[PDB]
């Protein structure tokens, strides 16, 4: 996260770290949507042009974390993956359309003050809250500049109008994406950056006081550049694929 601040403790209890076994390193962020399902970005697992293709056994998930590098004894729970599912129409060749993936954990993780799932939106929540100008929240342990944070970082950023998003980039934008970020006029700043991908863009409903995951950190062109915005997977638009995966393969 660029131009964010330190997270408070238990502020993002659904935040998951994707961690590589060998070498031991942060791959991406992710979020906990139930006791056995973790949501991330497809490109955190599969991106052929950079020879990226992780299987289950390459990876661990770390839930309940705050410090980036510490092994947080008695706080975090590290979990092994049972199975990975990447959206079958994820477009890594062109524009990262449908940059979503699910990971099923081998055993249920126990909830705690530091570990708790986020909601997924329904049509009405999405229709209501996904509006230009409405702010959501991005969290991660990724780069502090286009160096690295001691603790989980947070920034709140406004959703940007569809035309402005498209006019900021030569990449072809689909309805399965939205962008967020301040404009140069707006004065304030902040962005996801390297290592933050897969993590959650969340919003707190003013109706039921619940946090919902509206986006997944997907891509940008640099971090916190003027005139450029961060692009996020549109979670509700892909919810049927989510429900399908979970209903077919979950218990």
């Amino acid at each position: 996260i660029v131009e964010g601040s330190d997270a408070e403790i238990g502020m993002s209890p659904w935040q998951v770290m994707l961690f590589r076994k060998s070498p031991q390193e942060l791959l991406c962020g992710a979020s906990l949507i139930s006791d056995r399902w973790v949501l991330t970005a497809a490109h955190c697992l599969l991106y052929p042009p950079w020879d990226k293709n992780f299987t289950e056994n390459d990876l661990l998930v770390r839930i309940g974390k705050h410090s980036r590098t510490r092994y947080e004894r008695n706080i975090e729970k590290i979990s092994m993956l049972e199975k990975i599912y990447i959206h079958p129409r994820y477009n890594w060749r062109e524009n990262l359309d449908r940059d979503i993936a699910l990971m099923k954990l081998k055993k249920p993780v126990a909830f705690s003050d530091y570990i708790h799932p986020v909601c997924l939106p329904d049509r009405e929540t999405a229709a209501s809250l996904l509006q230009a100008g409405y702010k959501g929240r991005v969290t991660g342990w990724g780069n502090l500049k286009e160096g690295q944070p001691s603790v989980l970082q947070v920034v709140n950023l406004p959703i940007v109008e569809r035309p402005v998003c498209k006019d900021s980039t030569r990449i072809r934008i689909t309805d399965n994406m939205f962008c967020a970020g301040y404009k140069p006029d707006e004065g304030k700043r902040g962005d996801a950056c390297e290592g933050d991908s897969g993590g959650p863009f969340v919003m707190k409903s003013p109706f039921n006081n619940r946090w919902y995951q509206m986006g997944i950190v997907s891509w940008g062109e640099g971090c916190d550049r003027d005139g450029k915005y961060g692009f996020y997977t549109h979670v509700f638009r892909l919810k049927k694929w989510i429900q399908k995966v979970i209903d077919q393969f979950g218990e």
Partner: peptide, 29 residues
């Protein structure tokens, strides 16, 4: 949706506000 989803033990559950969630709420005009 999971019953208790999206309610944080150290905030919503004890009715504490975090430092910047009001910024979000103020944006929902």
């Amino acid at each position: 949706g999971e019953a208790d989803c999206g309610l944080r033990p150290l905030f919503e559950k004890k009715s504490l506000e975090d430092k910047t969630e009001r910024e979000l709420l103020e944006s929902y005009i």
